[PDB]
């Protein structure tokens, strides 16, 4: 996250931390995610596309820190890793960048609620907040796009929703952003998601509910003039989610 502040998992209790175990047994952080139901985490396909094997991943809930334990956190294996079959990448855009992870602990249980483990709500079909709405993004992503290190502590910042007409402008992104995507940025371009933030949540108030409006996907540089963060527009994917959460 560019800008914003350090936060805690209690402030973002749906947040999922997703790690990959390499050949040779070392474990690195790959992507964020969001708990949508007891056994289901939603994230972005591009995070997993190059290593699509469910056994390589570890998912944490209730995790506040990148490389140490948080009291109350739960560790999960991935029982099913569903990537979108229509996922593809153009010169810049990632299309249908959405994934589902079914989670199971060693004792064979799904997520157990607590102060630090909560589900986020899904929007209803094609339901979005108006452009200009202040929304919140969260992750363990880089603080500056040129950094090597990731922050040890979770971060959050506020961004504003931006219309497709303005995002599809030639000096923005042109036709690289579709109606299945959503753009958000700082008015002063001081704040954005970044590398390490993909799969994580764009959270908006929608009809009195904390709502998963977008999933961090892609952008040109982090916090760059006329280059908003681009998010999978969740309200355009409910039939996909609903059918694939059956299995």
């Amino acid at each position: 996250i560019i800008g914003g502040e350090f936060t805690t998992i209690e402030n973002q209790p749906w947040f999922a931390a997703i790690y990959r175990r390499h050949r040779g047994g070392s474990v690195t952080y790959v992507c964020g995610g969001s708990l949508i139901s007891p056994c289901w985490v939603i994230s972005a396909t591009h995070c997993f596309i190059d290593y699509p094997k469910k056994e390589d991943y570890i998912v944490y809930l209730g995790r506040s820190r990148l490389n140490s334990n948080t009291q109350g956190e739960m560790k999960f294996e991935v029982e099913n890793l569903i990537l979108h079959k229509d996922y593809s990448a153009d010169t810049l855009a990632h299309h249908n960048d959405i994934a589902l992870l079914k989670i199971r602990s060693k004792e064979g249980r799904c997520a157990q609620p607590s102060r630090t483990i909560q589900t986020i709500a899904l929007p209803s079909m094609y339901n979005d907040p108006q452009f200009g709405t202040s929304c919140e993004i969260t992750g363990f992503g880089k603080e500056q796009s040129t950094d090597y290190l990731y922050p040890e502590q979770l971060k959050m910042t506020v961004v504003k929703l931006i219309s497709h007409r303005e995002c599809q402008q030639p000096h923005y992104y042109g036709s690289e952003v579709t109606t299945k995507m959503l753009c958000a940025a700082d008015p002063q371009w001081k704040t954005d998601s970044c590398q390490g933030d993909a799969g994580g949540p764009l959270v908006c108030s929608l009809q009195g509910r904390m709502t998963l409006t977008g999933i961090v996907s892609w952008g040109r540089g982090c916090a760059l003039k006329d280059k908003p963060g681009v998010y999978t527009r969740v309200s355009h994917f409910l039939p996909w989610i609903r059918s694939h959460t059956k299995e």
Partner: protein, 375 residues
């Protein structure tokens, strides 16, 4: 064309591994193209068994039809306008001014190579050193001022050859300055040293190969501006496997097998800055490849150059300097490919001894190679 480039590169890589094997734990930069280039010139000066050995080892004969023109075409392509003061190369053969040259040698040499053998008086030892080093200085535009090995020059010296190269390339995609941080580099003896390493996240041509003994190793391609040149970095995956596992199996054809197998993949690369400079006494490496006669006072045959003679190569030197840093002022017209994806990018960390290869992509010429044992 590509042909004499294959043959020159094959030959020059073979010389490199002789130098690399004779200095297992030392930094080395070398030019396979340069050594091929000067020895192709020297071919014209040789006769009998001396000529035979050079031809056999190099894999081609400079007098064969199409060969000298092909090498000429190669040269113009390499030193073309793509070069933004990035590369300098020079070849030179120095012969005693006193020696009576075979009739028609110098015109023939000039026809095939468009340069002259230099005539110098070696009995003025101090002046001979000055002259030879001055040649190196001007033709590398000051980047290489002097050789050490010219100390061997002698009043009785009759024949010397020199080759010098400088390279500092401009990346197609620069490493951002902010990303340059101090990091641990693991030396081959098990010690570590703090060293400036550049970092960049983008789409790199990458492949993984296997040694004959079963060991994995990475190969990455870093293209220079406009894609005319590239640098290749190769290193074993596991820290315990020495770099020698790679250099023991090196050949020109292996390099292009790496390139032909590459796929563009989004990666974060951490790579040490480095500036290497090596002066290589060519005698041993060339002797190991069968060219023994040319260095033997009475056995040597340079009768194509001069026939009243005991005449032999007293001294044969290459000196190379390379700089690798962040910079990229781009003579590249295709805007830019980036990594837009916001996942944490998979990392390739080059923090143990690695080899590098600089190649000219249109011809496949291996211009430079080396081993960085300590940045």
């Amino acid at each position: 064309p590509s042909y004499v480039a294959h043959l020159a590169s094959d030959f020059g890589v073979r010389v490199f591994q002789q130098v690399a094997q004779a200095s297992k734990d030392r930094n080395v930069v070398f030019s396979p193209y340069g050594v091929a280039s000067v020895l192709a010139m020297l071919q014209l000066t040789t006769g009998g068994e001396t000529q035979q050995q050079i031809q056999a080892a190099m894999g081609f004969k400079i007098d064969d039809k199409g060969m000298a023109p092909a090498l000429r075409h190669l040269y113009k392509e390499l030193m073309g306008p793509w070069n933004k003061d990035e590369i300098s190369t020079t070849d030179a053969i120095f012969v005693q001014r006193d020696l009576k040259l075979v009739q028609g040698f110098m015109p023939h040499f000039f026809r095939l190579f468009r340069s002259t053998v230099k005539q110098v008086d070696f009995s003025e030892v101090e002046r001979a050193r000055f002259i030879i080093n001055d040649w190196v200085k001007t033709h590398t535009k000051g980047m290489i001022s002097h050789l050490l090995g010219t100390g061997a020059v002698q009043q009785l010296t009759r024949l010397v050859l020199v080759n010098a190269l400088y390279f500092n390339g401009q990346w197609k995609t620069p490493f951002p300055d902010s990303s340059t941080h101090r990091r641990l580099f693991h030396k081959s003896d098990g010690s570590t040293v703090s060293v400036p390493m550049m970092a960049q996240t983008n789409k790199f041509n990458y492949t993984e190969f296997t040694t004959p003994d079963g060991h994995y190793y990475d190969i990455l391609e870093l293209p220079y501006h406009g894609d005319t040149l590239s640098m290749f970095i190769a290193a074993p995956y596991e820290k315990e496997v020495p770099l020698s596992a790679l250099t023991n199996i090196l050949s020109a054809q292996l390099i292009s097998h790496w390139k032909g197998n590459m796929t563009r993949l989004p990666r974060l690369l951490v790579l040490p800055k480095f500036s290497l400079e090596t002066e290589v006494d060519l005698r041993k490496p060339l002797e190991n490849l069968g060219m023994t006669d040319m260095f033997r006072q009475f056995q040597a045959d340079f009768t194509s150059l001069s026939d009243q003679e005991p005449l032999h190569v007293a001294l044969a030197l290459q000196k190379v300097k390379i700089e690798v840093n962040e910079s990229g002022t781009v003579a590249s017209s295709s805007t830019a490919v980036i990594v837009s994806a916001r996942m944490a990018p998979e990392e390739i960390i080059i923090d143990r001894p690695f080899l590098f290869v600089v190649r000219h992509n249109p011809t496949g010429t291996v211009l430079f190679m080396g081993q960085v044992m300590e940045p």
